[PDB]
Amino acid sequence: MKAWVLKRLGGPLELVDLPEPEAEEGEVVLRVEAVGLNFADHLMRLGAYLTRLHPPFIPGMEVVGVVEGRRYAALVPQGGLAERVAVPKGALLPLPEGLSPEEAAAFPVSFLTAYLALKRAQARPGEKVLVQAAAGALGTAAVQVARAMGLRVLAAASRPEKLALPLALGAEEAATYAEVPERAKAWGGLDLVLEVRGKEVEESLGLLAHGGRLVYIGAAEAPIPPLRLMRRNLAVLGFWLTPLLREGALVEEALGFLLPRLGRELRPVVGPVFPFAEAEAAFRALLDRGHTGKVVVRL
Amino acid sequence: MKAWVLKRLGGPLELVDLPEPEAEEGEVVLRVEAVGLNFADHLMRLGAYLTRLHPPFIPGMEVVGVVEGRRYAALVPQGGLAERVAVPKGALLPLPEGLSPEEAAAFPVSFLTAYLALKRAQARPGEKVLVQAAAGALGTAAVQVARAMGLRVLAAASRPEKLALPLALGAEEAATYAEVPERAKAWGGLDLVLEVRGKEVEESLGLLAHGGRLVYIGAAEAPIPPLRLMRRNLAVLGFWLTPLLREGALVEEALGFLLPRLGRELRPVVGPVFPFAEAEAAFRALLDRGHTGKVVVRL
Ligand SMILES: NC(=O)C1=CN([C@@H]2O[C@H](COP(=O)(O)OP(=O)(O)OC[C@H]3O[C@@H](n4cnc5c(N)ncnc54)[C@H](OP(=O)(O)O)[C@@H]3O)[C@@H](O)[C@H]2O)C=CC1
Ligand SMILES: NC(=O)C1=CN([C@@H]2O[C@H](COP(=O)(O)OP(=O)(O)OC[C@H]3O[C@@H](n4cnc5c(N)ncnc54)[C@H](OP(=O)(O)O)[C@@H]3O)[C@@H](O)[C@H]2O)C=CC1
């Protein structure tokens, strides 16, 4: 089978021929159709992700493919950008009939992250939540899931032209980063903040209302002075999806809320779609702050 | 006052100084803040609109400005691209508090057109409607209004990258023109079609289910063989907003449904916003098939 391999951190991807995957007991080999790219994939190539993968390896953790006729979505540690991948049957996500490969590849990571982050921050119906990078994969998902949980969503992005999408998905208001503080004052403070920037975390805590909680989801772009936290009984939550995945209960509850809605109230925003042969281009797209939606590679 | 004048059809706009408008009994002079541009404005410059305006004149029919403190939206025959305009008090649209000038300028024409076109075609809750140019001013409005009336919306645009917005506003499915027929077959035919293209009208009637009606809203891009109509009891409706405006009952009913929702379930999509001095650039934007949303000039 053909597959892209990363032989050295910081190096280039090499499209090579490899042996067909072997399925151990409890596993199935699925024929890959689409792979959704994540910022984590980028951090992994540089050797900067929370989990340090040892080269050589096959990039891609979010796959969508076919198993004896049925199409699935699954999160694998690696081996995504290949024609075939072995997957523990118990990790397979069922999909609604018709759901496209491109739309399925933009679901797992973004929606599970959005839901778990809000659940962990105990988001209650009615609360105000600020979603940053609101026009991206994780952002566009969060907006929908937040609306599905009945929260008021204040969307933020780095460019004015990216604000229309979030506003269309349900954001009550939308603003560029420079204008967030003002919208924050008008809203009377935020109950929740999904931090994917990381550079202005302190400035973020200043937007929180009493008992507000900031979920630290990423530092894609600094300390947090424990004291500003006390005055308003604020909370900061570090967050990383991977570990959570190994918790049946959580996963179950999460899917119990997401799957029934997948394709209905929750629709993943597909962004740039690249052919298998343009994997490097797709990776670059991840870094293009002009793009919106999920970057997807189609086989 | 400063104002842009069109002295010759097909000619350029000239930014000139003119006398302050005079308010006759029943009128008010409002201080313009934003003017929304329409395709009709473009057709008028070339002398191709249903209503033939005689030069010289001031382009702009959709204004938003202030009157003794209160901000309004109003449809005037001309005089939009000027610092001030006289308007019959009875034509003034009230706006929800806070509604931005740019967002108010994208409401009147698009939403009234979308609503009246659907009402005239007797769109009933549950029916399937195909909205073309679904990522533009008239398109993005129609999608929302259709959803507000409970219809299933199949959105169509000329480019793949424009489909995300419509899908986000509520479109059940979205497709590029070339792929419409197929989606049409899967849906089992369309009950309604808002035709803004005009070039493929025949091909459009073939997408209609029994008793379906096609609303002819524009020919922005050919005859309609009366016989294909009979076999399925289809209907074709010519449509032009202007005349309708002179009908209190209609206008009243229309606003009675739109205003309460303006800013809530109905949010105008603001697109390219140009400064007063770039009026010509804004006009060009109207013709750029890359743009999405309402073209707006801000004073
Ligand atoms: N903790 C976890 O387990 C998880 C964390 N994430 C985090 O999501 C973020 C990106 O996710 P995906 O990659 O899913 O995202 P998206 O598609 O959201 O892309 C990232 C977006 O982040 C915003 N951003 C702000 N600053 C930068 C910057 N300096 N460089 C690049 N992007 C920037 C940009 O939007 P704009 O232009 O509007 O600012 C950009 O489009 C990362 O921080 C990633 O680590 C995602 C899943 C799980
Ligand atoms: N009958 C009436 O009284 C009214 C008619 N209209 C009609 O709406 C249409 C445009 O409205 P506004 O101007 O409000 O629209 P938008 O912002 O919708 O712009 C027009 C859109 O129409 C689509 N289109 C298809 N072919 C062309 C073409 N050859 N040239 C330019 N655009 C094209 C394009 O979208 P894409 O790239 O996705 O194809 C484009 O963005 C016109 O046909 C206008 O006459 C509007 C209000 C009232």
- Contact yes or no for B196/B179 (Cβ under 8 A): no
Burial label for A182, CB within 10 Å (0-12, 13-18, 19+), is exposed
What DSSP letter does each residue of B119-183 carry, written as one string?
HHTT--TT-EEEETTTTBHHHHHHHHHHHHTT-EEEEEESSGGGTHHHHHHT-SEEEEGGGHHHH
Q: How far apart are CA B128 and CA B106, in angstroms?
A: 25
What DSSP letter does each residue of A237-291 carry, written as one string?
EE--HHHHHT-HHHHHHHHHHHTTTBTTTB---EEEEEEGGGHHHHHHHHH-TT-
Helix axes A108-120, A137-148, angle to 10 degrees: 50
Cα A87 to chain centroid distance, Å, stands at 20
Q: How far apart are CA B93 and CA B91, in angstroms?
A: 6
Say which residue the tokens 């994939």 belong to: A41
Ligand 2 contact, B288 CB (< 6 A): no
A107 assigned ligand-binding residue: no
Helix axes B108-120, B137-148, angle to 10 degrees: 50
Would you list the domain boundaries of chain B? 2-109+268-299, 110-267
- Contact yes or no for B193/B217 (Cβ under 8 A): no
Resolution in A: 2.8
Say which residue the tokens 């040892």 belong to: A54
Asked if the Cβ–Cβ distance from A164 to B267 is below 8 Å, we say no
Q: Minimum-distance ligand to the CA of B38? A: 2
Contact residues on chain B for A293, CB-CB shorter than 8 A: 164
Q: How far apart are CA B10 and CA B38, in angstroms?
A: 17
- Contact yes or no for B61/B40 (Cβ under 8 A): yes
Cα B4 to chain centroid distance, Å, stands at 22
**CB-nearest partner of A267 from B165, B167, B293:** B167
- Contact yes or no for B193/B204 (Cβ under 8 A): yes
Q: Please name the residue whose Cα sits nearest to atom 23 of ligand 2.
A: B133
- Contact yes or no for B110/B268 (Cβ under 8 A): yes
Asked if the Cβ–Cβ distance from B165 to A165 is below 8 Å, we say yes
Q: Minimum-distance ligand to the CA of A270? A: 1
Ligand 2 contact, B38 CB (< 6 A): yes
Cα B98 to chain centroid distance, Å, stands at 22
Say which residue the tokens 């959005």 belong to: A114
Q: How far is CA B246 from CA A119, B43, B75, B123, B242, in A?
A: 53, 21, 11, 22, 7
Please state which of the four CATH numbers 3.40.50.2300, 3.90.180.10, 3.40.640.10, 3.20.20.150 is assigned to the domain occupying B2-109+268-299: 3.90.180.10
Cα A49 to chain centroid distance, Å, stands at 14
Residues in Cβ contact with A276 at an 8 Å cutoff, skipping those fewer than 6 apart: A2, A81, A297, A298, A299
Q: How far is CA B79 from CA B3, B61, B73, in A?
A: 8, 7, 14
- Three-state DSSP class for residue A225: coil
Q: Please name the residue whose Cα sits nearest to atom 27 of ligand 2.
A: B221
Q: How far apart are CA A114 and CA A241, in angstroms?
A: 10
CB atoms under 10 Å from CB of A192, counted, come to: 28
Please state which of the four CATH numbers 3.40.50.720, 3.40.50.150, 3.40.50.2300, 3.30.460.80 is assigned to the domain occupying A110-267: 3.40.50.720
Which structure tokens are listed for A29?
């080999």
A75 assigned ligand-binding residue: no
Q: What is the rounded end-to-end Cα distance, in angstroms, of chain B?
A: 12
Phi, psi at A268, each rounded to 5° = -65, 135
Which structure tokens are listed for B198?
């005009």
Sign of CA dihedral A206, A208, A214, A218: negative
Tell how strand A70-75 and strand A62-67 pair up.
antiparallel
What DSSP letter does each residue of chain B carry, written as one string?
-EEEEE-STTS-EEEEE-PPP-PPTTEEEEEEEEEE--HHHHHHHTT-SSS---SSB----EEEEEETTEEEEEE-SS--SBSEEEEEGGGPEE--TT--HHHHTTSHHHHHHHHHHHHHTT--TT-EEEETTTTBHHHHHHHHHHHHTT-EEEEEESSGGGTHHHHHHT-SEEEEGGGHHHHHHHHTSEEEEEES--TTHHHHHTTEEEEEEEEE---------TTHHHHTT-EEEE--HHHHHT-HHHHHHHHHHHTTTBTTTB---EEEEEEGGGHHHHHHHHH-TT--BEEEEE-
Residues A79-116 as b or e (16 or more Cβ within 10 Å = b)? bbbbbbbebeeeebbebeeebbbbbbbbbbbbbbbbbb
Report H helices in chain A.
39-45, 101-104, 108-120, 137-148, 164-169, 180-187, 201-205, 228-231, 241-245, 248-258, 279-287
Q: Is B172 on the interface with A (CB under 8 A)?
A: no
Ligand 1 contact, A276 CB (< 6 A): no
The backbone region for A68, taken as left when phi is positive above 0, alpha when psi lies in -120 to 50, beta otherwise, is: left
A39 assigned ligand-binding residue: yes
Q: How far apart are CA B99 and CA B95, in angstroms?
A: 7
Q: Is B209 on the interface with A (CB under 8 A)?
A: no
Q: How far apart are CA A28 and CA A91, in angstroms?
A: 10
B137 assigned ligand-binding residue: yes
Q: How far is CA B128 from CA B124, B141, B156, B236, in A?
A: 9, 16, 13, 16
For residue B75, how far is its CA from the centre of ligand 2 (angstroms)? 19
Q: How far apart are CA B106 and CA B12, in angstroms?
A: 24
CB atoms under 10 Å from CB of B159, counted, come to: 12
Q: How far apart are CA B184 and CA A181, in angstroms?
A: 46
Which structure tokens are listed for A64?
């969508």
- Three-state DSSP class for residue A176: strand
Which structure tokens are listed for B33?
């803040």
- Contact yes or no for B65/B85 (Cβ under 8 A): yes
Length of chain A: 299
Q: How far apart are CA B87 and CA B22, in angstroms?
A: 10
Q: How was this structure determined?
A: X-ray
Q: How far apart are CA A291 and CA A299, in angstroms?
A: 21
User: Chains A and B: how many Cβ contacts under 8 Å?
Assistant: 28
Question: What share of residues in chain A are helix, strand, coil (percent, to 5)?
Answer: 30, 30, 40
DSSP letter assigned to residue A19 = P
Which structure tokens are listed for A58?
């096959």
Q: How far apart are CA A247 and CA A265, in angstroms?
A: 25
- Contact yes or no for B36/B295 (Cβ under 8 A): yes
Tell how strand A190-195 and strand A208-216 pair up.
parallel
Q: How far apart are CA B190 and CA B173, in angstroms?
A: 13
Cα B32 to chain centroid distance, Å, stands at 20
For residue A188, how far is its CA from the centre of ligand 2 (angstroms)? 40
Asked if the Cβ–Cβ distance from A168 to B270 is below 8 Å, we say no
Ligand 1 contact, A155 CB (< 6 A): no
- Contact yes or no for A277/A14 (Cβ under 8 A): no
Residues B213-237 as b or e (16 or more Cβ within 10 Å = b)? bbbbbbebeeebeeeeeeeeebbbe
Which structure tokens are listed for A228?
């500003």
CB atoms under 10 Å from CB of B54, counted, come to: 7
Say which residue the tokens 């060009």 belong to: B284
Residues in Cβ contact with A211 at an 8 Å cutoff, skipping those fewer than 6 apart: A191, A232, A233, A234, A235
Q: How far apart are CA A33 and CA A30, in angstroms?
A: 9
For residue B45, how far is its CA from the centre of ligand 2 (angstroms)? 16
Residues in Cβ contact with B293 at an 8 Å cutoff, skipping those fewer than 6 apart: A164, B106, B135, B136, B137, B140, B165, B269, B270, B271, B272
Residues in Cβ contact with A42 at an 8 Å cutoff, skipping those fewer than 6 apart: A283, A286, A287
Q: How far apart are CA B71 and CA B108, in angstroms?
A: 14
For residue A138, how far is its CA from the centre of ligand 1 (angstroms)? 7
Q: How far apart are CA A217 and CA A201, in angstroms?
A: 11
- Contact yes or no for B78/B86 (Cβ under 8 A): no
Q: Is A130 on the interface with B (CB under 8 A)?
A: no
Length of chain B: 299
